[PDB]
Amino acid sequence: GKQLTILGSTGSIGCSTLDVVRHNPEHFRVVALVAGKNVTRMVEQCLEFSPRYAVMDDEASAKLLKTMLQQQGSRTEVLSGQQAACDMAALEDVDQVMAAIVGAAGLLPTLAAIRAGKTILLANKESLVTCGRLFMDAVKQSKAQLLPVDSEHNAIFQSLPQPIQHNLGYADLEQNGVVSILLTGSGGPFRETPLRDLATMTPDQACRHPNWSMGRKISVDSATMMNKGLEYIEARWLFNASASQMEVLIHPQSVIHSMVRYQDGSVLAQLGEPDMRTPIAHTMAWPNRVNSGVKPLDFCKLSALTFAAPDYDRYPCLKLAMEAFEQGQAATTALNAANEITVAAFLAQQIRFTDIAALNLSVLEKMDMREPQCVDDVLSVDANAREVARKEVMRLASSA
């Protein structure tokens, strides 16, 4: 039995991982569940999986959870707050930690798992978007195993050779026959929109993916290719890839999830249904395999597969992400933070669709921060970048 901690058990990734546990009771035992405020979901999960521990970040949520579990005869011990959440990530008997908390709040619990030398099933975006140097340095020091859960990074990982898989972050691509990492993205709803029409796209239009049904913020990041820009940042950290070892391709059908190019001409790819239980089950069972509940991909029921090079005039956020990487973790943290603000402003109809890239750039230009040296420095860059972005939004929404 692999013993697990699930950080962010009540969200989308957490629920999908619990479905894999559900399919494989003989392979995985839930030791600890951690969430924020979803008491109702958390009760159900505690009843089904009988974790030794459950933690809620919010103290009033933990209190309610403590009492309901007692009445429903649950023996799970209820804890509260961030220290408790990091402790679950570092439990002696825990083998793997599903790192699936959203936002900067995912940082310290994910780091706790890394410092404890655990296998980390990495979902939280902020980990490598904002703390990529700090976290890869930390995994190298503890020899923690990272296994990326994100569909694209997981596809890359599966398409990579065994010496890289087992030394992830540290191994040399070149020495292992790898010439580049091919990161694929859908191109969003506006792949073919006349460029001059982008300024007038509405929130509803940007969120109407042709081939996806997801939350508004991630849907906008798909439309700007900010989503791929952030995954570019993560992949360079995760896979130890230089700028010339990265290729971003638009692949509108999203059937190929990403690819790896080798020295002999070979390209290895992972394909599948768009269901997160595939990459989650891959990371949970690695180096073996487990049923995930995902139906086999039917090749006779596909759109024709196509590819194209991103136009940075169409996707300036993609180019900003790549440029941000070269400026360091202060810049990537600032871009991620500014983008949360400007995307929310766009969705609230305070700015135009094209003002996301323009204001993201303006924030980066106005920032003057030193390379972060610890998580606390990153949190400070993030706070400051948000304030700079909010003030840019207000300037635009008010004045000139």
Added chain:
Amino acid sequence: GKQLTILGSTGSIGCSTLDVVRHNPEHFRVVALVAGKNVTRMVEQCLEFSPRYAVMDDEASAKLLKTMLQQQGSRTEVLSGQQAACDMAALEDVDQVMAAIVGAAGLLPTLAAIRAGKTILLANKESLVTCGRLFMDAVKQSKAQLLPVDSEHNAIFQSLPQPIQHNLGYADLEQNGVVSILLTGSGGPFRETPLRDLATMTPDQACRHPNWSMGRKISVDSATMMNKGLEYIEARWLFNASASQMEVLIHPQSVIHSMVRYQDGSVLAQLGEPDMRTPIAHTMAWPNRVNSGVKPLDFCKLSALTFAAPDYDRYPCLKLAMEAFEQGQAATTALNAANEITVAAFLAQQIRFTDIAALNLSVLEKMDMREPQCVDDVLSVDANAREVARKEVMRLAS
């Protein structure tokens, strides 16, 4: 580096192998070259790669090679005949043997390499199409490592987990998370031809593949999907795959080379340019990589990738091969041999395009031979199958 014997050095695969060595002179030493009758090409290869031995199967050819190397000042030792070729495959100091002799002549030298526990870069079709049971048994015994060179099988191998790659031929697919092997094929030039028109296709039409330029025999095998049927037979042996663990898919663009389906939903695939140096260089360098001279696949200059299920009314030879596998090595050997006869007859304008599958079936129906127990037994089945086929052709053309 690695010491190589190249069986069939003067042919297409042999020449591509030597091009990989040309790109990687520090990683590969050519110890022995073995060929048939192509003395001119053989001299040039001995002068470039400085092997210790050169073998011509044909004795007149060996005598002529010796005279030319002498004139040219080379001290490469010249040998002749079948035992010599097997001896090269078995040399104590060699690491890898490129098995690229064409036809049943490739069998004994390939077996010699297997019995010697060598790493076998396997590119002879008869080895597994005709001798799959005998050769996989021999591989388990000697612990020889097979590395398939054929593009589809190599793509599958690249897409399989490490415990299968090591242990190739005896590993359990299901235990290693593999649901099935997805063997991809172009569908040939008549993929969209009305079925009514197949009976009147000419040899020049059958050989005119929209995306290929190969020899006539294999171009016809692509048109009938016999080529994929034979690869289906090899894949079942190579990958220890039952019928239910095999899927054949038409992929017209031939960009994906083949795939492997996994328990969690994942499908891994290998893609690349249509250039045999890629899989050759993969097998030579494994488990590492080398430069092959092949240019990087440009994803911005591709046709859209499509897939389709093969229709056995359009491709009866594919179904015959799948069925032949279940009947055993006598049936697979008979089919391969009959198909050589019928394709040649088609190309000679003695029979129609659709007679190839019809007479292939007819031969198998006529034959009941028992499972071969040794290479002599398969040679015997092969010889009898050809005679049945030639008579079927003569009857038809009569």
